[PDB]
Structures are given as structure tokens and as C-alpha cells.
């Protein structure tokens, strides 16, 4: 239970030992702290240890609504029958809603600025406040829920609170699906992998296991190679916002006070649409704000997120790179030369073999992100297979997939096909110029931007009764 | 048992798959696409006992791998000309809809 | 743990000029948390760190 | 697991060197499909009365046996191309592969 | 609750209730007793209940040697350095060895003939005494292990007890794999499934999972449909044995006294070679002796083995017939008409729907054994796929498979290829006339029989130092 | 529990003409089982129903 401070290796701790001549941590008796993930069957001499998913695997907006029953009621506004989600009672972002505050045992957002006294937020997922960028997306979808629930009350005044909440929840879940599979995933996998692992939806298959796979929780960490070392904020004309325009990320983690007291989400959303993401390259894998200084303000020592990813894969007993290549139907290099051809980079192959001895032992994240990106994608062949394979199961295996017959009417389907993330940002913030679709590709202002008008708004007409 | 008629998802995911009503539901084990690999066969990770090899080779310290392979000078960062930082944030947001792996509290 | 925005609920329960249906729906909400009276709601907010000074009567 | 070894262990351990319990004894079975229980995770179909399985009542196993498996044993057809040893080797082989323990009375 | 005497459905019981029209059990307050299989993770509200395999999955003769270190030492003769398995000290079979006696609390074998006081036998598996025909096979392999260890001692006088035991065990294991894959499985599956699921052995593949699947523990009960309702015993001229040559099975279960005091194993092995199995047919699935009188002598009521099979599959949470058809790639009937086509038997299809309502719900053993048998095999296509798939994993996934390079010398493999089950019967009994090769097909005396002298013995010359 | 064929190992342990190599390996075998002296071995056989 002493994992954060002690360095001794007793359960449940699995600290990361410090090598010699480390660039930062000069004392080798120190360590990087690490709690082993909770086993599914504690203390068993029979079952091979597995870990738990605390969330619903489905793409169901459970980051807004929660995945347990009491939490899901705690996020709801139980003062009236308008079916709303609960909002913050002390603060607002130019009138508009903010997420409510959580009441935690050990609150880490209070440590990031002691005079501000701004605790962490309450959303359907516990990690909402990890980054004000993340917090802003959580806030925007809270607002989108309430906007729909208000609009549906206009159409159907006799609908009570439960009916309203559920219908809003249903639409928001479909919007997270449409955005994800129409706009996001094609840009992760690239067109070739997208045809292969996500062919055209037919219908629901109740023999498709929709569970998250253990390896996926480590493979989808590819995104850490996209993290930029600052938070960017922009004024109404997309120029640097006046307080702090380029904040080092080591000073925004759990910094919920920056949303409340430093202009809200409008400037963060603008910097997200008008700043390029980091490009993963074999000699520039991940930035030192996350490799050297992760959570520096709220812990005795800053963490190494790539290293945590690799220790975690070991905590979960995941197989190594070649076993996942074999699984995926990809060739398994044995020698440095064979790995140099797979990576089309012999210098990096040699470095991996220097460390691991064999491509059988390369950790899945490290081998996965070392691979060369697919044409028009941001992952290599191995990660494409794991990520794509997972999302096909979440689609085919979801009885409530928005395109499955019976979930939505044919007209509501034709309406939902018009939604998009830039539209959602218009309807719920003071932002009035947003990205051309595809939002995840558009990154340069003002070339890739347009006014909140050229974009079709969602038509809720077919929701009347 | 799961209701024959269903308009909305349950919060926990229960009863999506009617034949196997916990599939995709919350507070359930991960599925394994490959059997686990652990030092003792069933619970201890590689890197736990000093001197115990993995498949004939010593276990590399994760932080060592990170220093030798992931480290790079911040001033040479390449910005992706065809992806916005919203590409990054949607991934984290979406990650937090699919999985969270609890670990014990301090 | 009592949440901060549940303090707004306490005011709705103490407002004499409030819909009786909305007050039943809140007392029922608190009952599922194991809080079966207005004073027990007050004491959970008190114990979980919040300013209860306007409700000491 | 020892890097070198001439003989099987008695428990099956260390056959597979990357995953040394696979095939060893006193371990859980592997699931080729996800399990199908009345409550999702433990109670079998047939346990709670009135609970249907996929839209239909659960047939008593004794009643399936009575109506489908039962036949007049005098009419038994001997298999011209198999011996009783074919049956018996099956049972012995089974007992080389799986035993599912129950609690004791 | 005491599942063997009470009919209350509390854990760990799950008793079979009695239909009102029952042909045997006239009291509906009664039940057939039933203990749920032990769960791998007791009382967990997180994992999905699964069951435990107490045995090693590999085809390694673990029913001779045990699957746990303490048991395997009790089966060895620890009074010298000859590498032998322990034999009965009180009784012999015309000089030949018999299995030792176990020491159980509540020994069922004692209940089958109180005055004989012959307890159950001690072997690698706990069910060795369930049928004296099974016991015979156990005894036969125990005498072979010892015969080999004696012979190896002549070749290698310097070898100690451990080497002699390990070396004979290695041989016996290879004999079981050879008889199983060369002679048994081709006659279960037929040539077409044999080609499809058991293609030619290439080599050890460490990525093949060798575990027993849960459904296999039900599917492989296909063999209950081969069970003849008598135990036949034949003298040295292959004629009915003078005392009781045709004993009902309800009087031989757990009757280890019949092995000891009524002629030993030769008359039983002769009856197994010279009596036909029962043919499974869609209108003749299983005989009343196992369906009505299973363990009648050691139990308050006779059990119904086909009914237990279906209750057990529900206990294990196995999916229904159609889910397994889909798993195997086979068409899935929805109507009685389509089921009639799948079974080539509409009358049988109607009976199943009356019971189950949908093919989705047919228990796997009932579906499996209702299907028509494949050509020159003794299962239908569903069971062939489950059984064949399982035995391919146990072969490709076994590091000690007898043909895997390094396990046996090229010369040793040449010699083992020559072994046969009829030869092991010659070497270890008083039988001088045995079935022609493919003992599993040969079934009629004298047409299918040959003198022992005409068969080549196992040559252990290449086992020398 | 105690097995009937383990009674023959007692005959060997008491047999004064057998060799000590054999007696040592049997005392170890019973020792792994918790029966450390010939008195403990006998009493275990009696306890578990033998003579
Ligand atoms: C050693 O044995 C390995 C295991 O082999 C299995 O067991 C033996 C006994 C045989 O029965 C054998 O036939 C079995 O395959 C064997 O590795 C296996 O190789 C296959 C072929 O590459 C792998 O199949 C690939 O799987 C990926 C990922 O999807 C899988 O798992 C998900 C999650 O459960 C399922 O939803 C899927 O249905 C898959 O089962 C697929 O993406 C991939 O399909 C794409 O593959 C090809 C080319 O890319 C095309 O058909 C399409 O583009 C597909 O879209 C394959 O289906 C299998 O995962 C792998 N298993 C393991 C455990 O690694 C290995 O090859 C053997 N080696 C030797 C030398 O014998
Ligand atoms: C509904 O979805 C089902 C699931 O499909 C998987 O997931 C979706 C998301 C897609 O990726 C889909 O492409 C995936 O397959 C789907 O059922 C699946 O159907 C396939 C094909 O019919 C089944 O494969 C067959 O399996 C048997 C058994 O072996 C399997 O399991 C063992 C143990 O895991 C492994 O060792 C094997 O590698 C297999 O994975 C095989 O014997 C069989 O192959 C033999 O037959 C084929 C065809 O004759 C030959 O080419 C081979 O070489 C062999 O001779 C197939 O591999 C799969 O088991 C089944 N899964 C489930 C869960 O039922 C279903 O068809 C979908 N239906 C619709 C309408 O969409
Ligand atoms: C329970 O098991 C008992 C064995 O422990 C069975 O007892 C045996 O049953 C048979 C059949 O009735 C008897 O056979 C008869 O034997 C007599 C004389 O035999 C003498 O010689 C034998 C040795 O050769 C010896 O065992 C006897 O004690 C006698 O010294 C003949 O005259 C008959 O024609 C016929 O062969 C067995 O003798 C009898 N006793 C024994 C010890 O075997 C009993 O049948 C079983 N009960 C049930 C219900 O199955
Ligand atoms: C899927 C995933 C997981 C595993 C979740 C689980 O199953 O428990 C983790 N990440 Fe990563 N991430 C972190 C920070 C500070 C980020 C900046 C906002 C960030 C981004 C990110 C994105 C872009 C992404 C997918 C495209 C992603 N995350 C996926 C993802 C920080 C962390 C930390 C800390 C962890 C846990 C590390 C550990 O101790 O094992 C983490 N993320 C896991
Ligand atoms: C594989 C198997 C199993 C399940 C094993 C496990 O994993 O625990 C069972 N059988 Fe069946 N069997 C029994 C009797 C009296 C037989 C006559 C000699 C017999 C034969 C037989 C054959 C030929 C066979 C394969 C070809 C086979 N068995 C496989 C097999 C009796 C039983 C009993 C009783 C059970 C347990 C029933 C329950 O309570 O679930 C059983 N066999 C299981
Ligand atoms: C361990 O192996 C030894 C040697 O192979 C076994 O020894 C033998 O034991 C049998 C049975 O006790 C003896 O057989 C018989 O002889 C007696 C007279 O002494 C006779 O009354 C019987 O009818 C039978 O013919 C045999 O003589 C004996 N041989 C030796 C060399 O000791 C021993 O039993 C084995 N122990 C176990 C537990 O298997
Ligand atoms: C910590 O939080 C406080 C808010 O309590 C930040 O203070 C703002 O900073 C300005 C300029 O220095 C001050 O005038 C006020 O205290 C705040 N602004 C307004 C408009 O009230 C403070 O800067 C934060 N410090 C750090 C290091 O994060
Ligand atoms: C596992 O084995 C250890 C050592 O024998 C024992 O202390 C522990 O209680 C066992 N665990 C379980 C769950 O039986
Ligand atoms: C509930 O909704 C009302 C009306 O919109 C609002 O004033 C109030 O603050 C909301 N309550 C919470 C806890 O969000
Ligand atoms: Ca979810
Ligand atoms: Ca075995
Ligand atoms: Cl996995
Ligand atoms: Cl299964």
C-alpha cells in the first residue's frame, strides 16, 4: 500500500528500477512508483491472473454518463424532470455550464495550485481532469446532452425526466460512434487497414464478443506519440490568448483551476483545432514532458509514461512483439537484420536488440510504436491489426449500434449522418469559426476553417411523437 | 434475467448480449486474445525476480528502454502537417469510454 | 461521499415554496444513498467537509 | 522453467515455456465460446423457475432423455465395423485428458 | 446441502427434477442428484464462472502416472531401484500383477459386494474402478510399464530407479499417442474430418494452446452412445465364460471384486476384442443401463447418464447447438424444417423442437449425437469439429510429442512406430490369440484374429548406452 | 491416507537383512509424508484402518 513512497518490491507494488547514469534520476536506490493492476480473482493458485475493465467496453458515451448505477444518478440533475446532467453550482464559463466538482479522498487537482482551491471534476470517467484539453471535451459533451434534452422537451412536453435523459443519452452515444468510425479511425489506420479490419457494416452479430482485450489497453496507447509538449490557447480570432498562451504540460496535469479561472474551454478547444499534433517518427517517439515530468506537481517524482506503458504490459503478462505479429498474421523477425527490414530502420532495430536480445521479448507498445506508419495512417501494421480488430468487435457486437435495425428509425438515421464535431462545438460554445471537416485533419488557421453556418445542424424533427 | 424488450442501454452494459449478458459490461475481466506470459506461469511479471530471464535473455528495465529508444531532444519535434491536436484528444476521450484498469489505492 | 452540487438539493428540500413532487423525488434520491431524513442529509454533507453553517437550526 | 530437460513433469508444468501452465493440471479450462448462464456469470439455465432461455422454457434434462434418448434396448444395433475396445479406449483416453472435480458429499 | 440425499436446490447442488410422465421415477418430489462442478474462482462477483481440469491435458498416459507429485510417488514402487509402478500385495491374476488398492473414505466399490471387501483401485486417475473393462486397460498399461522397465534394466544395468521410470513412462506415453492418433481417431472422425482437422504433423508449435476446452468435456461424451448394456467375458477359446458371461452393467459399476475374484483381466480383454460396440443411431441413442440404472448399486437411486450430460453442460454454462455450429462454420437451422435437413431426419427434428423450442437451445451433447455420422466415422460434423480441433492442439502444442525432433532418436522412432495394442496384450497377459491390426475395427472371432507369434515385439536395442 | 501396499515397505524397514541404501530411501519417502520415525509409520497404518 506504500507504493507511491517506498521502493521495496512487495505486493501490490511493482516499482521500476533506475538504470545507471540515468539522465534525470541520479540515485539508483530511488525508483519510479507503480501499483500492479487489480487482479480479477485475488489470491488464486488456480486462475492465470487477469485484470479488470471498470468501464463498459461499448462506444456508448460512458465517459459522460458513467458505467455504474449510483455514479450515473450522481451525474444527473434530480431537481426537476428536464432530464439534464448536473452542472457546477459555483462557477460558469461565460454563462455556459461547467462540470460539477468531485469529492475525493486524496484530491490531486488541489495540489497543482494551492491558492486556487479548485478540486477535480465529476464526470462518468474518473480521469476527466487529467488534462484541461480532456476536461474541455468532457464539458462540451455534457453541454451537448443538455442542449438535446432541452430541444426534445420543446418537441414532446409530456416526456418525463427519464425519457428525456435516455433519448439525449442515446443520441450522444450515436454521435460518439459516428465521429469515431467515420472521422477518427480512418485517420488512425489509413485507408488500406480500414477496408481490411472495418469492412462495411451489415448488421448485429450476437456471436461477436464485444469485450475489450487486454492487449488493447496497451496498444491503444499509441496516442502518447501524438502528444505535444504544451497546451495551446487561442482568443476569439485564433491568436495566442493573453494569460499563458503556451503552458508546459508538466504544469497542466490535474490543473482544473486553469479551466475555471483562466478563460474556460473556448480557448482550449481553439488551440486543439488550430495546432498540429506531434508526428510519430522512429527517432522522435515521445516527448520528455511525459517521459521525465509526468504528474510532477502532484507526486514525489515525475513519472516516465513510455516506461509505465512497458512495465504495465509486463504487469498484465502480455506476450511480446513477435507473438503479437504471429497473432496478426505478420512475419516474425528473428535477427537484427530481419527486424531492420520490418522497421525499415536498421539503426533502431539494433537498439531494440541491444536492449531486448530478441524480437520475441520486445514489449508490445515499444514494438508497436517503433513500426513505420501506414500510408495515410498513424500506426504501423501490428497496431493497425489490434486496434482495428478491437473496434470491429465493438461495432458488430453492439446490439445498440446506431445503424442496427430497431435502434433508430430510418429517418433518425438519415438525420444523425449529418452530425459532426465542429457543429457540436458551434452549438455549445462561444466559438463561431471552426474547422472544415474532417476536423482531425484540418489544423491550419484560417485556411482550414469556416463559419458556424456552412455546417448542417442536427434535425431532431423525426424525434417527435 | 434480461428483459425481452429493450429501448435503451443499461448503464453497466448488462444485457447487450442477451445470450451472454455480461459481455461488454463493467467490472468484468478483460478477454485474452493470447494466453498470459508471467515469470511463474500465473501471476508474477517479468522483471520481478532478479536474475530470471525471459525466453533466454535478461529482462530490460523499462526505464532503460525509455532512455535509449524513446528519449529525443524536445527542440527537434516534428509537427504533423495533416493531423490536428484534436486528433490526439479524441483518442484519449475515446480511450476513456472503452477501458479503465483499476489498481489499488494508497 | 457527498458531492458539492447535492448542496443545492438541500435548499430545494428546505424551500417551503417548492413542488411537492420534486421534493419527494429528491428525498427518494437521497434514500438510495442511505440518507432517510433531512437532518441525516445535513450531517453527511457536514462530515464530508462542506459548509453547513446556514442549516444548524 | 529449466532451460534444459529430458522428461515431462508430472503436473504438465513447463511444457510450454512462454506460458508454463498451459496443459498443466489443476487449472481452469479454456473457453472456445463465452459462457451462457442465466444471470450472466454463475447460475445455470434451469435453476430459477420460470426463467426462459432465449425466449423458450428450459426443458428438463430428464425429459429430453425420456423423449429423445430412450429406445427399446432389445433392438440395439451392433456395429459391424467397431469393437467394444473402441468404446473402451475412448473412456481411457478421456481419463488422460479431463477430470472436472465436484465437491465431496 | 447433502446433494446425494436431499432434493433441495441450494449450493453446491443442482438436482435434476423429474417430469410427470416419467417411465421409472414415479414420485415428482424425488430427483436425480447432482453436484455442480467446482468453480475455478469461488464466490467471485467479477469473473464468469469456469470449471477446473484436474488432469494434464497432454496425451501423456497421466491416467497411469498421476497428474500431481504426491500421487505419482504413491504409484511408484519405492522399495528398490528398478523404476517400477506399485502392484497389489494381497492379490495376483494368475501370477500377473494387479493394480494396488486405494484407501478412500466411503469406498463405493465395497458397496457392490459387501462380503468380498475388495476396495477401489489406486491409479493415476480416480475413475479407474468405474467399469471393470476400464480397470483392465489400466492394469494392462501398468504391466507394460513394468515389463519395459525390466527390459531396460537388462540393456542398461547402470541406470538407477529414476531413469528407468522416466524412460519407461516416456515409452508408454508414446504408445498411447501412437495408438490414439494412428488407430483410434481415424475411426472416430472418418477420413474426411481426419484430413481436415488432423493434417500431417509438421512440428512443435509453441503458439498452439494445448488446454482442454470446456465444451470438449461434454462433446467427448459422444462415446456414451457406444456403450453395450452388458459386460461380456470370454474364455481362452473366445467362448462365453462359465460363471456369468453376460453381466448387466448396473451390476458391474465399481465392481472391482469381479476383476480380483472372478477371473482377472483376460476374460474381459477377450470380450472387448470379440464383441461389437453399439452403433449410435438417431432412433437408438443410449441404452437403459446407463439411462436408468447408472450406479444403481452405490446410490440411493439409479442415475441417467444422458440426462447428467445435459445438466452438466448447463452447469458449465456451455452455449447451445447453434452457437457451436456457428463456431465450426456449419449452417445454423432456425426452423423445424431446416433442422430436419441438417439431421437428415425430420421426425427427430420435430421431437427436439417440441422439447427445446429452438435449435439455439439444444444442449451440445444432444445436438452433437443426434447428427448423422460421417462416412467411416462415428460422429457427425459438429462433434468431429470439436473433437478433431482439440486433438490437433494437444499434438501440435505438445513439446514432448513423440515425433517432435529431439524427443526420441531417429532409430527409437522407427522402433516405436511398430507398437500396437494387440501386441501389448500379448506381452502382458495369457492371451495367445488377439485381434488383427486395427483392434478398434476387428470384432469377430475367429475371422478377425491371429496368433500372438505373428506380431513383431517392440525392439528396445536403440535404448542402450 | 495410508495405502495398503505401503505395508510392504514396513516389512523392508524392519527386515534386518536388507541394505541400508533401500532403508534410507524408504525413510525419506515416508519422511516427505510427515512420518519421521518407524513408530509414526506404524501408528499411521493402524490409524487408517490396517493391522
Ligand atoms: C503456429 O500456430 C498458430 C496457431 O494456429 C492455430 O492453431 C493451430 C493448431 C491450427 O489450427 C492453426 O490453423 C490455427 O490457426 C498459428 O498462428 C495463427 O495464425 C493465424 C494466421 O495468421 C492467425 O490468424 C489471424 O488472426 C488475425 C487477428 O484476428 C484473430 O483473433 C481475433 C480475436 O479473437 C478473431 O476475431 C479473428 O477471427 C482472428 O482469429 C486476423 O486479423 C487474421 O486475418 C487476416 O488474416 C489474413 C491475412 O492478413 C486474411 O484472411 C485477412 O486479411 C484477415 O482479415 C488471421 O485470421 C492466428 O491469430 C494465429 N494464432 C496465434 C495464437 O498466434 C501460427 O501461424 C502457427 N505457425 C506455424 C509455423 O505453424
Ligand atoms: C458472426 O460473427 C462470428 C465471429 O466472427 C469473428 O468476428 C467477427 C468480428 C469477424 O472478424 C469474423 O470474420 C470473425 O470470424 C462468426 O463466427 C465465426 O465464423 C468463423 C467461420 O465460419 C468460425 O471459424 C471456424 O472455426 C472453426 C473452429 O476453429 C476455431 O477455433 C479454434 C479455437 O479457437 C481455433 O483453433 C481455430 O483457429 C478457429 O478460430 C475452424 O475449424 C474453422 O476452420 C476450418 O474450416 C475453414 C472453412 O472450412 C477452413 O478454411 C479452415 O482451414 C479449417 O479447415 C473456422 O475457422 C469462427 O469460429 C466463428 N466464431 C464464432 C464466435 O462463432 C459468424 O460467422 C458471424 N456471422 C455473421 C452472419 O456475420
Ligand atoms: C460376492 O462376491 C463373492 C466372492 O467374494 C461371490 O462368492 C462366490 O460366488 C461363486 C458363485 O456362486 C462361488 O462359486 C461356487 O464355488 C463352489 C465351491 O468353491 C470352493 O473353491 C473356491 C476356489 O476355487 C473357494 O473360493 C470357495 O470358498 C470354496 O473353497 C462350487 O461348488 C460351485 O459350483 C461354484 O463354483 C464362490 O465359491 C463364492 N465364494 C468365493 C469366495 O468366491 C458372490 O457370488 C458375490 N455375490 C454377488 C451377489 O455377486
Ligand atoms: C487506452 C489508454 C490507457 C490505458 C487505460 C486503462 O485501461 O487503464 C492509457 N492511455 Fe494515456 N495519456 C496520459 C496523459 C497525461 C495523456 C495526455 C492527455 C494521455 C493521452 C492519451 C491518448 C492520446 C491516448 C489514446 C490515443 C491514451 N492516452 C490512451 C491510453 C496518461 C496516461 C497514464 C498516466 C496512463 C496509465 C499509465 C500506467 O500507469 O500504466 C495512461 N495514460 C494509460
Ligand atoms: C470426457 C468424459 C466425461 C467428463 C470427464 C470430466 O471432464 O470430468 C464423462 N465421460 Fe463417460 N462413462 C461413464 C461410464 C459408466 C462409462 C462406461 C464405461 C463411460 C464411458 C465413457 C466413454 C466411452 C467415453 C468417451 C468415448 C466417456 N465416458 C467420456 C466421458 C460414466 C460417466 C459419468 C458418471 C460421468 C460424469 C457425469 C456427470 O455427472 O456430469 C462421465 N462418464 C463423464
Ligand atoms: C517392488 O518390486 C519388488 C521386486 O520386483 C516386488 O517384490 C516381489 O513382491 C511379490 C509380492 O509381494 C513377491 O511375489 C510372491 O512371493 C510370495 C512368497 O514370497 C508368494 O506367497 C506369492 O504368491 C507371490 O508369488 C515376490 O517374491 C517379490 N520379489 C522380490 C524380489 O522382492 C515388490 O512387491 C514391489 N513392491 C510394490 C509395492 O510393488
Ligand atoms: C494560482 O492560481 C491563482 C488564482 O487563484 C492565479 O492567480 C491569477 O493571477 C493573476 C496574475 O498574477 C492575479 O492577479 C490573480 O490572483 C489571478 N487573476 C485574477 C484575474 O484574479 C495564479 O497566477 C496561479 N499561479 C500559478 C503558478 O499557477
Ligand atoms: C495458495 O497456496 C499457498 C501456499 O500453500 C496458501 O498459503 C494459500 O492459502 C493458497 N491460496 C488459495 C486461494 O488456496
Ligand atoms: C438543475 O437544473 C436547473 C434548471 O436548469 C438549474 O438551475 C440547476 O442548477 C440544475 N442543478 C444541478 C445540480 O445542476
Ligand atoms: Ca463505454
Ligand atoms: Ca494427460
Ligand atoms: Cl490479450
Ligand atoms: Cl468452451
Numbering used by the authors:
A (entry chain D), E (entry chain B): 279 to 743
B (entry chain C): 166 to 271
C (entry chain F): 47 to 103
D (entry chain A): 167 to 271
F (entry chain E): 47 to 97
Lines quoted from the article behind this entry:
The heme enzyme myeloperoxidase (MPO) is the most abundant antimicrobial protein and contributes significantly to oxidative killing of pathogens through hydrogen peroxide (H2O2) mediated formation of highly reactive oxidants. In 2017, de Jong et al. were able to identify a small 8 kDa protein that has evolved to specifically bind and inhibit human MPO. This protein, called SPIN—Staphylococcal Peroxidase Inhibitor—is unique to the Staphylococcus genus and is the first known protein-based specific inhibitor of MPO. While rMPO is a single chain monomer with low heme incorporation, native human MPO is a ∼150 kDa dimer with each subunit consisting of a heavy and a light chain formed by posttranslational modifications, which are linked by disulfide bridges. In this article, we present the first crystal structures of the complex of SPIN-aureus and a truncated version (SPIN-truncated) with mature dimeric leukocyte MPO showing full heme occupancy.
Next, we solved the crystal structure of human MPO in complex with a truncated version of SPIN-aureus. SPIN-truncated contains neither the N-terminal domain nor the HDD motif, which are both essential for inhibition. MPO-SPIN-truncated crystallized in space group P21221 with four heterotetramers (one dimer MPO bound by two monomers SPIN-truncated) per asymmetric unit. PISA analysis of the interface properties suggests that the interface is similar to that of the SPIN-aureus C-terminal domain. Additionally, all hydrogen bonds and salt bridges that were found in the MPO-SPIN-aureus cocrystal structure are also present in the MPO-SPIN-truncated structure. The rmsd of superimpositions of the eight SPIN-truncated molecules with the C-terminal domain of SPIN-aureus (chain E) were between 0.25 and 0.30. We observed waters at positions w1 (red spheres) in only two subunits of the MPO-SPIN-truncated structure. Of all well-coordinated crystal waters present in the X-ray structure of MPO-SPIN-truncated, only three are replaced by residues Gln37 and Asn38 of the N-terminal domain. While SPIN-truncated did not have a stabilizing effect, we found that the MPO–SPIN-aureus complex is significantly stabilized compared to MPO alone in both physiological (pH 7.4: Tm shift of ∼ 1.5 °C) and acidic pH conditions (pH 5: Tm shift ∼5 °C). Binding of SPIN-truncated is enthalpically driven (ΔH = −17.4 ± 1.6 kcal/mol) and entropically disfavored (-TΔS = 6.0 ± 1.5 kcal/mol).
